[PDB]
DNA sequence: CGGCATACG
DNA sequence: CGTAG
DNA sequence: GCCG
């Protein structure tokens, strides 16, 4: 088992989906009191676990895998014997994790302000409606769509959405194209936003594109919010029988010199993005982002033409984003 | 012990 | 501060 | 919390 997610295929489904779910309660409860450091070794804990390729069914199976030290391998002990590991239930059912969740899912709140919030004695949803001028607009949205917004949306809605973003982009810009990344793009069948990363093969011509596409989007009356420059952070009207479901969308642009790092980050997982970002600087000496790749001894970016041409670079064998779901 | 990814709105 | 992966 |  290599020691970073991005040297190990993970498939969406696998075979311990019971003792990662665990870990990663752990790992986002570590996040509510601030201790990254402690979120990061409980979600690698977990990611090990997803690329193994059967059931860990003894401890024994946990000696030698990188990852487990004495308190995860504890957790998974106490799931083995008896179902049920005591740590994680007292975080499941603790107040300050409840509230921190239900706060933290909300569009425009953050770990920071869901815990003032929580300090001020706010527990529910109701608690924040009844004080509105506190909210920034954002929250507002974030809070009037919530509903909305923790119901999942189907691939099928999916391709609605993206034909519609299509139409608006051919307007925009005659032979700019609209690729779908995220979840869906790693093999999901639900998921709580859909991301579209938006280019064209002349390089320079996706200037400026992103605030007409939004404007021809507003237009079409299917934008519910908006910020309003390369990310959009939006919410989207999508049709559904009789009526209409709001549903988070991002849409990003990159010149098509960027675009294969750019489809690498916004293809996740969020920890195998980290991970090949660890594994560039710490094994590699090189820099990635959503950008580029930089040699700092060179001074120098790598032109990559594909994600297969960034993984080459690493020296990492290619994983599909299928594979990437750590 | 230091380090833990790296951006944009 | 928020957002993204 | 764990790794190097
Ligand atoms: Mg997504
Ligand atoms: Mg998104
Ligand atoms: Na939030």
Known sequence: MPAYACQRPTPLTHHNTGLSEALEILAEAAGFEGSEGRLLTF???????????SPVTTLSQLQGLPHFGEHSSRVVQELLEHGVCEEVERVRRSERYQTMKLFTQIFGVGVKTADRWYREGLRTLDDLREQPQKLTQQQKAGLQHHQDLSTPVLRSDVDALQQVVEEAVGQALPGATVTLTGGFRRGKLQGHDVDFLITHPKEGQEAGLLPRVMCRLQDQGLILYHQHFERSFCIFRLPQPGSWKAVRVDLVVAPVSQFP?????????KLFQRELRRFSRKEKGLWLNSHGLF?????????????????????????????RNA
């Open 261 to 269: 790092f750019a489809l690498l980050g916004w293809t996740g997982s």
């Open 295 to 323: 040699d700092p001894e060179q001074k120098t970016f790598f032109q990559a033409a594909s994600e297969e041409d960034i993984f080459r670079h690493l020296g990492l064998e290619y994983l599909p984003p299928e594979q």
């Open 43 to 53: 979600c690698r804990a977990a990611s090990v676990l997803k690329a193994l390729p």
